[PDB]
Amino acid sequence: PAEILNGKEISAQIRARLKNQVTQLKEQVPGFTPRLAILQVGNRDDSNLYINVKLKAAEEIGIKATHIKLPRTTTESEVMKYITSLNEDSTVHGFLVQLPLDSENSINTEEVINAIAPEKDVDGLTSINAGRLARGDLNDCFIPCTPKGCLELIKETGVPIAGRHAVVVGRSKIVGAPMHDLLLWNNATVTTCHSKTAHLDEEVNKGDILVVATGQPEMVKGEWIKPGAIVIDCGINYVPKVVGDVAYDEAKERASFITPVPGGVGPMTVAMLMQSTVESAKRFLE
Amino acid sequence: PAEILNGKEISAQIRARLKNQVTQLKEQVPGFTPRLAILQVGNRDDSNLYINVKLKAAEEIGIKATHIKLPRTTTESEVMKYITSLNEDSTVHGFLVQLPLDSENSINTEEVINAIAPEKDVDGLTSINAGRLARGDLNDCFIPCTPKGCLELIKETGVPIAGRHAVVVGRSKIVGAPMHDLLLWNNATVTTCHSKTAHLDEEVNKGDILVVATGQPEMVKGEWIKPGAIVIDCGINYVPKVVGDVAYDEAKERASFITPVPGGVGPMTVAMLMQSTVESAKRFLE
Ligand SMILES: NC(=O)c1ccc[n+]([C@@H]2O[C@H](COP(=O)([O-])OP(=O)(O)OC[C@H]3O[C@@H](n4cnc5c(N)ncnc54)[C@H](OP(=O)(O)O)[C@@H]3O)[C@@H](O)[C@H]2O)c1
Ligand SMILES: NC(=O)c1ccc[n+]([C@@H]2O[C@H](COP(=O)([O-])OP(=O)(O)OC[C@H]3O[C@@H](n4cnc5c(N)ncnc54)[C@H](OP(=O)(O)O)[C@@H]3O)[C@@H](O)[C@H]2O)c1
Ligand SMILES: Nc1nc(N)c(NC(=O)Nc2ccc(C(=O)N[C@@H](CCc3nnn[nH]3)C(=O)O)cc2)c(=O)[nH]1
Ligand SMILES: Nc1nc(N)c(NC(=O)Nc2ccc(C(=O)N[C@@H](CCc3nnn[nH]3)C(=O)O)cc2)c(=O)[nH]1
């Protein structure tokens, strides 16, 4: 059986570090506090939960997080006006738009996200930030929070990444595609799979490192895992309880390290958002 | 043995269609013509060679191509002046900076590259354009010219890309990394290899599609190629004569299709730049 990677516990460590960092930065600079804005469109249930988990994490740490909930009937132009105000508000060190936008109207997500000024783009979702990470300019961009969390879980095994074959299953903007970029510039040999991949099972079996972000509940079977592999499960799936994208019970039999769901990637996602907001708060001072 | 993908003959088809496309624009909109500008730093022999190749092709087509050559001793502040002038020059539709800069002063390539207006970045080197491509927003960006030209070559086989396993060897900003993105959003399963990649012979042996962009003369041996593979060699290596990054003889015995070196990717890169130039000039009329 595989050692469980304890995200709920690993993240506690990070949030305690960040809180101390924020208190130092308030003693060192009086009246100053990191400020975060989360913009939501519509009223999705799951967006409400993740937004509010982020609100909690910002409160435990010392970050000032504001939440703006727009109606499902809002227009693209209305959303831009908010982005516009946030860009120029020199007190806001970072904001994000929780995705997907739940509007009855037709709104260009890419247009909205790309209007975020890259210095405040703590979610790493602008083309600008994505283009730097996609070309290995890793020390001047914000890296998407879920991939940041995943790398950290990988490093906690002690297993060096360089030279290992990583499989990433999923190519989403927020997770799968930046996760491939992060592993590549960490000198893994990376294979990216998706819904047109044939013989997925055999591709998954080459993975020394395996990151699954498909949103298909327990679709990746344990037999597919390479014996001794590091498995990272980004799935959060609500079924008849919460399951990940990997059939956890059989995968823990062949993995050497595995992430449970819940309590794995998800808390680490939240923590890395907090880290990026402290970083952009610092970068403002300097 | 393998059909040869003839870069000479294929690039000549596209240039002529570009040419007649230009001629009809000039009849439709009297006086107008597409203008390209190439900026060079230093006096590298090879960059002189390739820039002149682009000048000749633009001449055949009806693209007015200016070449500006700055000395090795120029400062980053000097290059910045010229880039800003090209950005602001309304009769220039696209311009590129031939890489790598050749300078005694240590000049920040990424600072220089990213000042180019993205609407004129016909080489697809701005971070804005790298991130649109890396995330699948393929309708608003200039794809880099060499990957464009491998993609055109692979399409000449008539064998669909979706579903096949593609192995990209190399992760450079100009070829390797953007080739992965192109193949990925044409729905291949893509493995990207580099120098910390172990057992390259075996990662290669997975390629239904194999693109090699190492600059390591004939380092991919023919014996590693999967039988029936489509082989694309981006190499140009001067040795005891020009050779590619693949062992051509043995590889030809196993591939279904293969690019000769020279006469393969090289003329396709030039033709793609001209196609990108004509497209940015079209977008300017409107
Ligand atoms: N976004 C959120 O709010 C959120 C929150 C918590 C957890 N997550 C988790 O994060 C992960 C991904 O984020 P997302 O929801 O933004 O992604 P998404 O848009 O739902 O895309 C899922 C990815 O998985 C691929 N996929 C679907 N079925 C597949 C199959 N049978 N075989 C292989 N690949 C398949 C899709 O491939 P194609 O590209 O070919 O369609 C796609 O690239 C999921 O595990 C999800 O549960 C997301
Ligand atoms: N750039 C030009 O003007 C030009 C002109 C003519 C032809 N070309 C050809 O086009 C390609 C372009 O290369 P570039 O100059 O753009 O980039 P580059 O800086 O030469 O990088 C070459 C890439 O190949 C990888 N590589 C090197 N040795 C390797 C090995 N033994 N095993 C696996 N991977 C290895 C390197 O991996 P790391 O990232 O780990 O180093 C790197 O990513 C080359 O094939 C070159 O001959 C380029
Ligand atoms: N812009 C933008 N848009 C997005 N959609 C995202 N993604 C995102 O926010 N993901 C996300 C995933 C997990 C969790 C979390 O807290 N997981 C806990 C408890 C789960 C649980 N479920 N039921 N009870 N508990 C656990 O997995 O352990 C929080 C947020 C983004 O990052 N940026
Ligand atoms: N910004 C920027 N910077 C860059 N460095 C590049 N790269 C680039 O331009 N590469 C390049 C390589 C080959 C050729 C070509 O024409 N090849 C012919 C003849 C070659 C030959 N002639 N004599 N010996 N070999 C052939 O190989 O058949 C054309 C362009 C870029 O695209 N953009």
Curated annotation (Swiss-Prot), chains A, B:
Subunit and partners: Homodimer.
Organism for this UniProt entry: Homo sapiens (Human)
Domain remark text: The N-terminal methylenetetrahydrofolate dehydrogenase and methenyltetrahydrofolate cyclohydrolase (D/C) domain carries both the methylenetetrahydrofolate dehydrogenase and methenyltetrahydrofolate cyclohydrolase activities. The larger C-terminal formyltetrahydrofolate synthetase domain carries a third formyltetrahydrofolate synthetase activity.
Disease: Neural tube defects, folate-sensitive: The most common NTDs are open spina bifida (myelomeningocele) and anencephaly.
Effect the entry attributes to changing K54 to A/I/S/T: Decreased methylenetetrahydrofolate dehydrogenase (NADP+) activity over 90%. Loss of methenyltetrahydrofolate cyclohydrolase activity
Family classification: In the N-terminal section; belongs to the tetrahydrofolate dehydrogenase/cyclohydrolase family.
Tissue distribution of the protein: Ubiquitous.
Outcome (variant: K54 to E/M/Q): Moderate decrease of methylenetetrahydrofolate dehydrogenase (NADP+) activity. Loss of methenyltetrahydrofolate cyclohydrolase activity. Strongly decreased affinity for NADP. Increased affinity for 5,10-methenyltetrahydrofolate
Localization per Swiss-Prot or TrEMBL: Cytoplasm
Binding residues annotated for NADP(+), in chain numbering: G170, R171, S172, S195
Active-site annotation: K54
Role according to the record: Trifunctional enzyme that catalyzes the interconversion of three forms of one-carbon-substituted tetrahydrofolate: (6R)-5,10-methylene-5,6,7,8-tetrahydrofolate, 5,10-methenyltetrahydrofolate and (6S)-10-formyltetrahydrofolate. These derivatives of tetrahydrofolate are differentially required in nucleotide and amino acid biosynthesis, (6S)-10-formyltetrahydrofolate being required for purine biosynthesis while (6R)-5,10-methylene-5,6,7,8-tetrahydrofolate is used for serine and methionine biosynthesis for instance.
Region (Methylenetetrahydrofolate dehydrogenase and methenyltetrahydrofolate cyclohydrolase (D/C) domain): 1-281
Residues the entry annotates as binding substrate: Y50, I51, N52, V53, K54, V97, Q98, L99, P262, G263, G264, V265, G266
Effect noted on mutating K54R: Reduced methylenetetrahydrofolate dehydrogenase (NADP+) activity. Reduced methenyltetrahydrofolate cyclohydrolase activity by 99%. No effect on affinity for NADP and 5,10-methenyltetrahydrofolate
Disulphides: none
Protein name: C-1-tetrahydrofolate synthase, cytoplasmic
Name of encoding gene: MTHFD1
